[PDB]
Amino acid sequence: LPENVDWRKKGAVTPVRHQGSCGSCWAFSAVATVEGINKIRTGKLVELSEQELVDCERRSHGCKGGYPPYALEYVAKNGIHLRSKYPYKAKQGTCRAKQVGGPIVKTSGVGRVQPNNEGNLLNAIAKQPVSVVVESKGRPFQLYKGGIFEGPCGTKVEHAVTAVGYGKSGGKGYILIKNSWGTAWGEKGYIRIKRAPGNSPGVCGLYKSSYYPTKN
Numbered sequence: 001l002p003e004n005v006d007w008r009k010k011g012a013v014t015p016v017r018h019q020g021s022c023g024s025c026w027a028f029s030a031v032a033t034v035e036g037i038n039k040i041r042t043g044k045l046v047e048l049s050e051q052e053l054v055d056c057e058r059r060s061h062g063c064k065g066g067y068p069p070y071a072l073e074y075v076a077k078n079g080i081h082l083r084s085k086y087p088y089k090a091k092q093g094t095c096r097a098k099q100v101g102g103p104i105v106k107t108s109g110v111g112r113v114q115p116n117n118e119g120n121l122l123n124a125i126a127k128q129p130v131s132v133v134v135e136s137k138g139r140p141f142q143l144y145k146g147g148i149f150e151g152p153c154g155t156k157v158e159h160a161v162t163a164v165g166y167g168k169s170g171g172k173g174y175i176l177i178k179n180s181w182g183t184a185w186g187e188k189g190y191i192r193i194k195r196a197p198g199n200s201p202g203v204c205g206l207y208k209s210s211y212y213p214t215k216n
């Protein structure tokens with residue numbers, strides 16, 4: 001395993017986006033992982049539609065919160081359209097997957113990493129971008145402006161994000177995360193969260209529930 005990994009440098013990460021006031025983080029996390037694996041397999045970075053998921057994947061609740069593994073199952077089964085063909089509007093509407101055209105990106109399944117273990121997570125990230133969860137309700141997290149984040153924060157997760165890398169910053173290990181709150185938050189939309197060693201729920205509950213899409 002490499003000491004440091006950063007999928008941004010390998011052209012596998014699209015620019016940071018803004019979910020607005022719609023509890024759509026679950027769709028944002030899911031889309032970022034599929035954009036990454038599509039780049040890795042085909043050599044092409046294309047932007048995909050969070051809105052298709054919000055409108056069509058209904059085991060989830062649209063703008064009221066959802067579930068990354070379900071979103072990942074929807075993509076493996078139905079594939080997903082381009083962001084330019086089915087743009088994000090921060091509100092749940094009628095599913096138009098079959099009315100919008102343009103090409104579709106499809107995957108072959110979805111993997112579940114065994115939670116609460118640093119190692120399990122690092123090996124998954126070394127491979128590709130991973131959907132991860134975190135407790136974002138605390139003021140420290142909302143007011144984050146930079147550095148290696150340590151909380152204060154509990155482990156009562158409620159916000160899905162995307163791990164696009166990991167590394168070491170002079171002595172402290174961290175995990176590189178792509179948030180969906182725009183570029184004015186954190187480190188140009190990103191946050192480097194401290195790495196809890198070995199068996200642990202992770203700082204702010206980061207090791208609690210991780211998924212990724214597979215692609216032939």
Ligand SMILES: *[C@@H](C(=O)O)[C@H](O)C(=O)N[C@@H](CC(C)C)C(=O)NCCCCNC(N)=[NH2+]
Nearest residue numbers: 022023024025026065066133157158159160
């Ligand atoms: C995240 C966001 O937009 O910031 C969005 O609320 C979301 O999808 N949250 C998830 C939590 C992550 C997957 C950790 C969520 O809360 N999903 C399902 C809602 C659970 C409903 N709970 C009860 N008690 N009814």
